[PDB]
Amino acid sequence: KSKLPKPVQDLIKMIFDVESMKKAMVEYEIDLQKMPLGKLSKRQIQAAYSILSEVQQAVSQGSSDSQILDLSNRFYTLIPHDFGMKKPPLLNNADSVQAKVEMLDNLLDIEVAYSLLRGGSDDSSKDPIDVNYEKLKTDIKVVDRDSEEAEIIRKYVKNTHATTHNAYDLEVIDIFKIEREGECQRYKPFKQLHNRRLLWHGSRTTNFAGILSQGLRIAPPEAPVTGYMFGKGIYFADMVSKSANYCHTSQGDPIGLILLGEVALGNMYELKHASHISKLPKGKHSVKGLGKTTPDPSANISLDGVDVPLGTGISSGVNDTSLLYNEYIVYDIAQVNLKYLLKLKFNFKT
Ligand SMILES: O=c1[nH]c(=O)n(CCCCN2CC=C(c3ccccc3)CC2)c2cccc(F)c12
Numbered sequence: 001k002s003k004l005p006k007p008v009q010d011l012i013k014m015i016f017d018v019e020s021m022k023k024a025m026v027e028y029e030i031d032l033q034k035m036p037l038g039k040l041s042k043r044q045i046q047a048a049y050s051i052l053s054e055v056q057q058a059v060s061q062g063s064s065d066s067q068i069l070d071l072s073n074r075f076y077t078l079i080p081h082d083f084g085m086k087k088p089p090l091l092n093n094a095d096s097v098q099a100k101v102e103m104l105d106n107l108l109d110i111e112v113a114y115s116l117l118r119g120g121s122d123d124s125s126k127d128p129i130d131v132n133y134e135k136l137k138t139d140i141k142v143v144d145r146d147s148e149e150a151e152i153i154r155k156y157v158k159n160t161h162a163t164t165h166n167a168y169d170l171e172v173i174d175i176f177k178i179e180r181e182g183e184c185q186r187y188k189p190f191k192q193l194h195n196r197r198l199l200w201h202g203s204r205t206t207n208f209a210g211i212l213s214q215g216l217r218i219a220p221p222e223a224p225v226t227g228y229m230f231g232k233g234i235y236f237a238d239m240v241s242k243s244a245n246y247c248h249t250s251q252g253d254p255i256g257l258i259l260l261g262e263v264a265l266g267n268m269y270e271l272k273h274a275s276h277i278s279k280l281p282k283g284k285h286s287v288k289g290l291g292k293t294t295p296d297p298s299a300n301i302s303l304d305g306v307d308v309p310l311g312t313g314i315s316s317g318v319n320d321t322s323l324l325y326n327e328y329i330v331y332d333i334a335q336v337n338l339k340y341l342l343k344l345k346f347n348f349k350t
Pocket residue numbers: 105106108109200201202203217218219220228233234235236237238242243244246327
């Protein structure tokens with residue numbers, strides 16, 4: 001087998017884990033002995049993103065009441081749900097509309113995972129951890145633990161474990177450093193941008209087969225602008241936990257992968273409520289959703305010209321808002337580059 005460090009091999013295994021993939025599919029409500037995860041077409045996946053949008057011209061301009069439901073079963077025709085039986089959410093509603101635009105986000109990254117594990121390995125004369133790892137086009141060094149740099153990480157995780165969702169508690173198992181090919185280069189533009197940060201990205205595990213081969217991405221050319229709080233960028237927290245709930249770690253799979261990304265923020269569009277932008281106005285390089293908890297400015301490490309806000313959860317002064325923690329959003333893919341991965345046990349509670 002691979003000379004690959006054992007944390008790496010094992011990490012390959014969990015992100016290329018097909019069973020898992022259906023697990024998540026079922027967690028949306030998918031009917032898999034209707035539509036199986038060989039069939040998941042990027043084809044169908046984007047044809048239904050468009051159906052989510054037409055339902056929001058519709059619902060946001062009053063509309064033919066009956067068509068709203070036609071658009072709804074159109075949707076359901078296209079993505080089989082094991083409903084199974086209750087009564088299905090008929091898409092007159094901004095709420096279940098993004099409920100479903102989250103699902104499709106995941107089927108995207110899941111199709112990238114699933115289609116990925118049918119390229120190269122019928123081998124053998126390279127082996128199975130080995131083939132998956134190369135098709136990541138990424139290099140995954142094991143960060144060495146008792147060293148200062150793993151400790152800054154864990155200090156980050158620590159101080160930014162939130163003030164409210166302190167039930168689970170967190171714990172770090174492996175610190176992977178990461179290089180995807182070429183994204184040093186594409187990021188070069190933003191290399192010297194002002195105002196530049198280490199922030200968090202949690203995702204389900206079943207997504208990181210696709211985050212490693214494509215980086216984080218902006219949403220499809222068809223995905224509702226209205227499906228995302230801040231329209232169609234890429235999303236980051238400073239608080240470890242605002243991101244860490246996004247992996248969807250239960251008691252029956254409490255291991256989570258979180259990213260650390262360097263992100264070229266510049267001048268932040270400050271915003272307390274939602275804002276369905278496509279478009280960032282001139283003079284503005286990022287958005288900042290304003291939270292009532294910031295990490296403590298009294299603590300703000302800056303290594304390599306990037307800031308790192310490993311600061312305990314302090315009240316900002318901002319009560320006026322729909323967000324409890326900050327978020328950051330960028331509208332160009334190159335405006336971020338991935339630095340670390342973390343393997344995390346979500347250690348639940350009593
Ligand atoms: O760490 C975080 N991770 C997240 O997942 N979200 C939720 C928002 C994600 C919105 N998406 C944008 C569209 C996606 C996509 C998927 C595949 C292909 C193209 C786009 C994926 C995800 C976050 C939201 C706020 C603060 C955060 F820290 C996160």
